[PDB]
């Protein structure tokens, strides 16, 4: 499925080049600018456990998910991955646990050593 396609075709966007965060651009965005640390970022997303069975989406609440980029407000893979997106871009991320919840997990929601998959649409971003 989509996770396997990211393994096969995804770009390694980690600094260590350990393939811990792999990305496919599914829809190209506009212009050249990508968000800076501190920017208010607005996204729609769907996230799941790649193996396990748990599913989460901002469409559930039918409102965008908002966070400040690069402040450790979200898992490391998002700070890394969303920084590489343009406005209007949709991307797939496959995320190994080292860039998510690691060995601790976040039980009951997230098991230990879990791989996560997300589809993320970057709606907009703004300086404060
Ligand atoms: C720096 O590390 C962390 C920082 C924050 C967290 C909490 C989960 C953090 O979620 C995440 O970082 C990732 C990426 C963003 C969308 C949500 N997300 C999740 O994993 C989802 C998620 C969604 C949640 O509710 C919306 C969670 O409840 C807080 C949650 O808790 C562990 C996890 C998963 C749900 C199961 C299926 C796979 C996805 C979170 C959730 C809701 C709002 C958040 O920030 C907005 C703000 O604070 O205004 C941050 C975990 C962190 O690492 C373990």
Residue numbers in the entry: 13 to 140
The authors write:
Here we used the FK506-binding protein 51 (FKBP51) as a model system to evaluate whether chemically engineered proteins can be trapped in pharmacologically relevant conformations. FKBP51 has emerged as a promising drug target for chronic pain, obesity, and depression. The major challenge in FKBP51 drug development is selectivity toward its closest homologue FKBP52, as the binding pockets of both proteins are very similar, but the biological functions are opposite. Selectivity for FKBP51 can be achieved by targeting a transient conformation characterized by an outward flip of phenylalanine 67 (F67in and F67out).41−45 This conformation is rarely populated in the apo-state of FKBP51,46 but enables high selectivity vs FKBP52.47,48 To stabilize the transient binding pocket of FKBP51 (F67-out), we aimed to lock this conformation precisely by the formation of an intramolecular amide bond (sites displayed in Figure 1B).
